[PDB]
Each structure stands twice: as C-alpha cells, then as structure tokens.
Amino acid sequence: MALVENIKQFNDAVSSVKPGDEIVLANGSWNDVELVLKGKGLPDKPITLKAQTPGKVIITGQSNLAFSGEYIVISGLVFKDGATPTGEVISFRTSNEDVANHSRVTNTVIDNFSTDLRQMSDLWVAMYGKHNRLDHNSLVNKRNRGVTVAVRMNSEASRKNHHIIEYNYFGPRQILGANGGETLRIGTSHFSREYSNTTAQYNYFDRTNGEHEIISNKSSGNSLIKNVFFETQGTLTMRHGHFTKVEGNYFLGNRKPNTGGIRIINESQTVSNNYMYGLTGKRLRGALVIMNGVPNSPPNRYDPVIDSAMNNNIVIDSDHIELGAGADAERSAAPSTSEFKGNIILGKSNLEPFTLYDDMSGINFEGNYLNDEASTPIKTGFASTPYSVTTNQYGLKSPDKALLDEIGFGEVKLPVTKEEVGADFYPKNEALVAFQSGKTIHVKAGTDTLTSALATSQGGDVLVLENGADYLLTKFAEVHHPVTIMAKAGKKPVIRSQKPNFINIENGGALEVENLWFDGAESPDYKGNTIIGTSGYSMNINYNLSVRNVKVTDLDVNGYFYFFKANAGTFADSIEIIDSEFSNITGAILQLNREVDDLGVYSVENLVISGNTFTNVKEEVVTVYRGGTDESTFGPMVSVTNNTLTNVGKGSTHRSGASMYFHGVQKLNISETKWDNSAPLELFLTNGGPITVIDNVEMKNTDKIRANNDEYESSNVTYD
C-alpha cells in the first residue's frame, strides 16, 4: 500500500490508516526520525509498517519507534549507528495509557544504537501491553548501559502479558565495567510479585558479557526455556518473582572465563533439564546456584528459597555448584522445602565443586551423579559414576546413553542454532580487529614522524621504528583503532614530546607498545603530563593496553607526571605492564582510580603487572578503584608477579599515600615482589567474595601492609 520517503508522507499514512493497510518506508536513509504509529488493527487484517526491501531501509541519528493499538506489525527495519532521544529505541507504547496489544516486531535490526557516553543507559526494545511477539530480530553492538530487551510491568495493562520473545539473536556485548548490562530483563523490583507470564524461548545469546546477569527475571510466572548461551559471562538469574520455569537451556561456556549457569532465588522455581558445558563462574555466578535470602525481604533484596526443584541438569567440565550462596548477616535464610534430584555432574576441573555456605537440610538430594574423581560434602543423595563424556553426532560433549535414559533427557542437542535466530538478511560478522593483523608501516626518525604514521594507519597495523633513533612529538599521537608501536631486535628508540601527553588512546583505539624508550626532556612545565592517556571524552568502545619491554625515564619537569592515566568513562578489557623499567617519575605509573560515582563503576577488567622495576616514583605504581557495594560485575581482576619497587609512593601529592592501592578489587594475586624504602601496600576490601592471595613478598624498610579488614590471605611476608 502507501509508500513513503519522508516524515510528512509517513505521518499522513499513519493518520489515514485502517485494518489491512501497509505503510512502507522506501529504501534509503532515515536520519533523526521519531516514528509514531497508532491504530486498532484486526486479527485477520493487521496494520503493518515494513521496509521496502529489508536491509535497505536504515534508520540513524536521533531516531526511535513508538506504537500503540492492536494487531500492529513491524518488519524488515534496521536501526544502525545512532541513538534514541527518549529512554527506548523500539517501544510497544505511545503514552503511559496507550500500549500495543496483539502486536509484533520481527525481521528487524538494532546495530549500535548506543549513546556516545558509555555511561548513559537506555532500553533497545521495551515491551508493554498484552500478547505481543518479539521474534527473528538481530540486536548487536550495545556499547552503552541499559537492557537490550525489557518487559515492562508498570501498570495492569502490561502485566499478565503472555509475551513471546522467540528466535532472537543477541550479538556480543562488551563488558560494561559497571552494573546495568543485562541482555533481557522481565519486570522490575517495584512490581516483582505480579505475574508477567512471559516466554523467552529459542533465543541465542552470543558472548553477551555485559555484567553477571545475562537474563534478570524480575516477575512471577515466566518461562525462560530452550535458549542457547554461547560463551556468555554471567548467569540466568531468578532475580525477583516466583513460579519460574527454566528448562531446556544449553550453556556453552567452552572453558571461557566468568561463564555462569542458573541462579535460583525466591519461591516456587523449577530449574530442570538444562545442559551446561565448561562453566568457570563462582559464588553468585556458579554453574548452578541456590542463594540464601533475606527473611521478610524488601523487594530490591532477596527472598528465601522455598518449594524449588533443581533437577535433571547436566553439568560437564564446570567448576561451581553454590548452595546457600550469598549467606551473611543480611542473607541468613537457607533454602527450604526444595530439592536437587537426578543431576549428572561430570568434570575434573574442580574435584570439590560444591561450596555449602550454610546448612542444606531444606534441600532433598536424591538420584544425583558425580564422577569418581570428585567429592561432595553431601553425605546422601549422590552416587559415584565413571567420568565418561563422549562427543556425540552434534559435536556436544554428551555423557553415556544409559545415564541419559535413566533421567529421561533424550538426545543432547541445541534447541536452536546461530543460523535459525535473528534477521535473515543481516550478517553475524565478528567485530574482532586483532592486534598485529594489518599492513606493516616503517617510521623514519624525526619530528612528528610517528604522529603522521599513526594518523594514516589502519586498524591492526604495525608501526616499526628505527633501532636507537630519536623520535620527537610536537602534536598528540592519537590512537583511533588497534595499533602496535614497536621496535624489533634490542636497540630502544627514544621518544620525547613537547605536548603534555605523548599518546592519547581515543574511541575505538587499542594500543600495544614494545621495545620503546620514553623520556621527558622535551615535556612542558605543566603539572599533569602523562606518557599514555585515555581520550578525555567518554569512550563507548572498550580498549586494551599492552606495555612490553619499555624504558621510561625522567618524568620530572614538574610534579604529577604519570606514565598512564585512565580517564573516567573509559574501560580496558586488558591492561598489561611487562618487562619494563621506570625511573624518576613525579606522578604514578597506573592511575586507574578516576571513577568517582561510588556505585560499581571501575576502569579495568584484567590487570597484569609483571617482570618490572620501578625507581624514584613519588606516587603509586598502581591505584585501582571500584567504590561502593555493587555485586553485579567481575570487578577489577589484578595479578602482580616478579617486581621490584624502590623509593615508590613516598611523596605528599597522592591521596592514598601508598605504593600500591587496591579498593574494590575482586581477584587480587600479589607474589614474588619486593618493596625497598617505599610506601606500604594498601588494601580496601569491599563486599562480594574478594579473592586476595598475597605470597612471597619482601618488604625491606617499608611499613607493613595496610588494610581496612582481614578478609585476605597473607603468607611468606618477609619484613626487610
């Protein structure tokens, strides 16, 4: 019917709409468009809004879609590189009272509708009203905060909805490094007791690693069944609400880090007939979790587990089954009137997978299996079994056919594949620009030669520098894509700069430097200079920093001169500082303490400091900060091995007054390192389960380890 190519023609076709009529957007770009479509369609005659050719109609800029009435259909659309001017990209409503009932969004795409500020949050699809369908859609590259798809329950109209979120493709989602990165959320805490009755089936979750919750269930009566979780970090949690059915879900961890399974909280839940391979998650992110609750709980906390069944689940090569997880003064109530029956746990990665944080008499264990090699503290309900896991006709590591016939599982096979989900026209091309994957450039020694090479380089390229040659910068050496700046063999070229900062890693940029020498002889007489620094504007694309075999000297023109400053609103998936030497620096080596909100936002996911020497550093070698009490993220994970510190942290300018400072770090491993006439190593351990193993550390002429509390393991700590 009526084809349109502008906002006027479109709103005319909306005003003049009736059951059966189809409004078509013509192939081409639609920038800054706030699409509103109202109308009462019919079961036999539905009011449609479609693309002329699915994939050729593209919506960018400050654009969105709002719709209300009955039997509305949205199909073929694309929403690429832009942002909604409201809180939702696609909305199943037009006002608080006008919601869409019996409507459908299908064969539609949302690719990078992320706001430029990585800190801003918004919902990409917000479902309202009753009996709507959301299927065969691809939603990729969410680089800001908020839920990819949410089911709203703010009013009786949207409650007991019976929505179906089917065959959708949830593309990779980088780590937020803060709370608020769920892929699917059904309801909120304010309306948790109400039944939503939603069904989320046949969806594929591909590396959706936002935070520790891939699905946050926050209402009663929903069914999260037949889904695939390919290498996803975090868990499917029964966050709030009762009577949830979680079955037929395959979780392919492939031994990838921080991969979790299912977390039971609250009442009358049924987690049965799920498959789980190689899940490495622990505590609230275990492969199977049954939490401890808060008795007579406030809605935003945890209801004690009652009347629940975790049965007939296959757990192959996974490390943790957490019973009573989260137990403390707050969560004092252990599961009751529940059961754990006929489970097949086969894995040699952890031979004591069960971690029982409280008494588990409330649970009825019976008919379970655990490989001969592994032990369980649970005296009854468990039977010994040979560790026989063979790759079946579908490529999945399946156990023996007798054990499957005993529990009634059937053929171990995916309920859906990456090829059956999402939009048919849109490709699932990986956004993986690897380091050293491009053309190699040769940089002649001189003034602004590294600057020019960078400016015209491509993503993944390698800039090779002249061994022993002097390089000077007079302009910022900007890094807008992955880049390697190295020199081969063993003659360090000497880089100096007349700007406050040498290299700025900008949005989309990732940097690895090898065999380089940085020196401050040309650095200006300003406080706050740095060798490497992040953008200075929010970076919604995660970065990486690898510093290998580097010399840094004389950063002393003025005070507060750093090696690295990671600005707020920037986030590294990986920071590595290896085989390097640092001398005479008036600031700090790594300033990763700039997140000032105190609500779980931190600057680095993985931090490795190894094989390094530091001499005459007026501030810290490293200061890592994740303030507050948030339990939604895998916090900063730090490793500090084989290092020497000499005259570090003795200055009066840094506020911690430490050589190494750790606040809110969730996995801290310090070993084989020595302190000499430096400032003490400081800890500030926060909530959650912070793993801290300090071993074989020498501390000559240095005041002993500072700490807020003693929740850390310290061995072989030699004073002097």
Side-chain angles (χ1 to χ4, degrees), residues 2-6 9-14 17 19-39 41-43 46-49 51-55 57-192 194-225 227-244 246-255 257-281 283-340 342-347 349-378 380-383 385-386 389-396 398-400 402-404 406-410 412-417 419-428 431 433-438 440-443 445-487 489-490 492-582 584-673 675-710 712-718 720:
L3 177 62
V4 310
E5 185 39 84
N6 77 32
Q9 287 176 20
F10 171 94
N11 298 127
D12 278 338
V14 161
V17 95
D21 292 320
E22 76 177 8
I23 310 171
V24 188
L25 303 177
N27 287 355
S29 278
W30 297 73
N31 200 294
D32 292 51
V33 286
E34 293 178 31
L35 302 177
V36 181
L37 176 67
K38 298 194 202 180
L42 293 173
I47 301 173
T48 295
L49 167 58
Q52 173 192 320
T53 306
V57 171
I58 296 166
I59 302 172
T60 74
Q62 308 278 284
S63 310
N64 64 2
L65 173 62
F67 54 93
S68 56
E70 321 265 337
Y71 304 88
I72 310 168
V73 182
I74 288 89
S75 50
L77 303 188
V78 180
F79 285 83
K80 182 163 179 170
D81 303 332
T84 176
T86 54
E88 303 151 353
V89 176
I90 295 168
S91 187
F92 288 72
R93 79 168 181 186
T94 60
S95 79
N96 298 1
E97 293 85 4
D98 314 327
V99 301
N101 306 297
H102 295 100
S103 312
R104 177 179 180 197
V105 173
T106 171
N107 217 33
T108 48
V109 175
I110 306 184
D111 187 344
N112 200 342
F113 244 54
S114 319
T115 65
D116 284 313
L117 291 166
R118 87 183 272 121
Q119 305 102 326
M120 289 315 316
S121 39
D122 54 30
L123 319 180
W124 279 12
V125 180
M127 308 184 80
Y128 290 94
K130 309 191 211 276
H131 300 280
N132 302 299
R133 185 152 171 241
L134 186 73
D135 68 278
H136 305 94
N137 304 303
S138 279
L139 297 109
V140 298
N141 302 308
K142 189 158 164 57
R143 294 174 184 150
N144 71 336
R145 306 198 178 149
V147 206
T148 314
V149 162
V151 179
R152 313 266 291 111
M153 294 269 297
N154 56 312
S155 67
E156 198 54 51
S158 303
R159 306 187 175 117
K160 322 191 115 105
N161 46 73
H162 300 263
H163 292 326
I164 301 169
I165 302 164
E166 230 177 340
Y167 293 95
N168 294 297
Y169 175 69
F170 297 108
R173 178 150 179 197
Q174 54 171 217
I175 301 168
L176 266 269
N179 176 38
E182 51 271 31
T183 305
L184 166 64
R185 180 188 72 217
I186 313 175
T188 54
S189 51
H190 299 91
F191 332 101
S192 76
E194 321 289 12
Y195 287 73
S196 169
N197 304 109
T198 312
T199 296
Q201 54 174 42
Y202 304 121
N203 304 302
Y204 199 103
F205 291 86
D206 187 24
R207 313 181 289 274
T208 53
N209 308 351
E211 63 148 85
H212 84 319
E213 288 192 272
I214 306 148
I215 307 186
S216 188
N217 195 66
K218 288 176 159 133
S219 42
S220 331
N222 322 325
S223 303
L224 322 173
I225 65 162
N227 300 291
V228 182
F229 295 85
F230 190 92
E231 302 207 68
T232 63
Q233 295 190 15
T235 53
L236 189 155
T237 104
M238 259 132 291
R239 194 57 194 88
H240 299 124
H242 316 298
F243 297 92
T244 323
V246 185
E247 57 202 42
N249 303 287
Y250 282 62
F251 287 76
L252 291 161
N254 301 334
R255 296 299 308 175
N258 294 324
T259 46
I262 298 168
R263 182 165 60 139
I264 292 179
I265 323 177
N266 328 284
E267 325 189 3
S268 299
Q269 324 284 8
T270 300
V271 175
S272 54
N273 296 61
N274 302 285
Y275 171 82
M276 268 104 54
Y277 176 68
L279 309 185
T280 78
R283 198 187 162 88
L284 321 167
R285 297 78 147 179
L288 279 177
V289 181
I290 300 177
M291 287 202 58
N292 245 49
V294 189
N296 308 316
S297 208
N300 63 341
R301 299 312 289 156
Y302 303 82
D303 265 305
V305 173
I306 249 116
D307 194 30
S308 306
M310 190 166 261
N311 313 147
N312 294 358
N313 297 306
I314 303 170
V315 175
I316 294 160
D317 287 318
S318 311
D319 306 350
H320 296 272
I321 292 176
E322 315 276 9
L323 304 173
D328 51 16
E330 150 89 326
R331 311 170 189 116
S332 48
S336 37
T337 60
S338 306
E339 65 196 51
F340 186 86
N343 292 288
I344 306 162
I345 299 140
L346 291 171
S349 326
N350 187 14
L351 295 190
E352 275 163 292
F354 297 85
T355 318
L356 274 65
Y357 306 92
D358 205 315
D359 172 15
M360 299 289 136
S361 317
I363 314 175
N364 174 28
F365 303 95
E366 176 196 316
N368 313 290
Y369 293 97
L370 178 57
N371 60 288
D372 302 320
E373 306 79 24
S375 117
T376 168
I378 308 164
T380 83
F382 289 84
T385 185
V389 277
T390 72
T391 299
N392 62 354
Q393 73 227 227
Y394 312 105
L396 310 177
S398 169
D400 309 342
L403 277 173
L404 297 181
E406 235 253 303
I407 74 159
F409 203 94
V412 176
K413 73 160 172 306
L414 287 177
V416 83
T417 48
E419 292 82 5
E420 296 178 274
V421 300
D424 42 23
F425 58 96
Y426 223 72
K428 291 127 195 155
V433 193
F435 266 130
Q436 308 159 302
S437 69
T440 291
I441 308 173
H442 287 277
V443 189
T447 307
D448 291 325
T449 69
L450 188 51
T451 313
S452 266
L454 256 154
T456 58
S457 70
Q458 290 287 137
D461 287 2
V462 186
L463 305 178
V464 192
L465 267 60
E466 272 164 49
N467 286 257
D470 292 25
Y471 285 90
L472 165 78
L473 312 178
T474 84
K475 310 187 201 179
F476 286 141
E478 309 192 319
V479 176
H480 295 82
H481 43 72
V483 169
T484 312
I485 301 178
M486 60 94 54
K492 262 154 190 181
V494 184
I495 311 170
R496 293 187 175 90
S497 169
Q498 305 187 335
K499 288 291 292 206
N501 332 327
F502 283 36
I503 305 173
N504 281 353
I505 307 170
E506 294 291 319
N507 212 18
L511 184 67
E512 52 173 46
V513 303
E514 213 200 24
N515 212 352
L516 291 185
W517 187 332
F518 307 88
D519 188 84
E522 308 277 326
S523 304
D525 206 16
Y526 299 132
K527 288 173 175 72
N529 298 338
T530 175
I531 294 316
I532 312 174
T534 56
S535 181
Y537 289 123
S538 184
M539 286 166 54
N540 71 13
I541 303 160
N542 290 7
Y543 74 94
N544 302 280
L545 180 72
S546 178
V547 172
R548 191 170 257 127
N549 190 35
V550 149
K551 202 179 184 161
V552 180
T553 52
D554 302 0
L555 304 196
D556 65 339
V557 186
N558 217 317
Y560 307 92
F561 202 148
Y562 299 69
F563 172 62
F564 181 66
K565 273 194 266 167
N567 289 153
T570 81
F571 191 75
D573 271 282
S574 182
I575 296 179
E576 279 175 339
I577 301 293
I578 296 165
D579 301 332
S580 305
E581 167 183 24
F582 303 80
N584 194 204
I585 291 155
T586 62
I589 306 303
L590 302 179
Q591 215 201 35
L592 298 150
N593 77 331
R594 305 184 61 103
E595 292 292 355
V596 110
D597 289 296
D598 280 327
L599 34 81
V601 48
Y602 54 104
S603 311
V604 64
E605 186 81 343
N606 293 269
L607 180 56
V608 166
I609 304 177
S610 204
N612 285 60
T613 66
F614 310 85
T615 306
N616 308 333
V617 187
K618 300 197 179 190
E619 304 187 354
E620 313 94 351
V621 159
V622 65
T623 175
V624 193
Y625 190 78
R626 183 182 69 99
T629 69
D630 174 74
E631 276 173 314
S632 316
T633 63
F634 301 95
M637 297 177 291
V638 188
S639 178
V640 185
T641 79
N642 190 27
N643 302 286
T644 303
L645 285 81
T646 324
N647 188 24
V648 186
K650 303 198 75 256
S652 61
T653 60
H654 49 143
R655 58 178 177 266
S656 72
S659 53
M660 302 234 297
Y661 182 84
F662 306 105
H663 191 130
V665 173
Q666 264 175 267
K667 219 222 70 237
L668 179 56
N669 277 85
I670 308 164
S671 76
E672 320 128 19
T673 61
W675 276 246
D676 187 355
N677 189 35
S678 292
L681 160 57
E682 174 147 26
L683 307 178
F684 200 103
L685 311 109
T686 67
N687 77 329
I691 286 128
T692 309
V693 177
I694 296 182
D695 182 77
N696 203 34
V697 284
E698 194 190 337
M699 273 182 53
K700 181 158 147 288
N701 195 16
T702 317
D703 305 277
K704 206 59 95 173
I705 303 183
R706 272 183 309 208
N708 62 328
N709 72 70
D710 258 279
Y712 68 99
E713 305 193 337
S714 51
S715 53
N716 306 348
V717 179
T718 310
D720 287 68

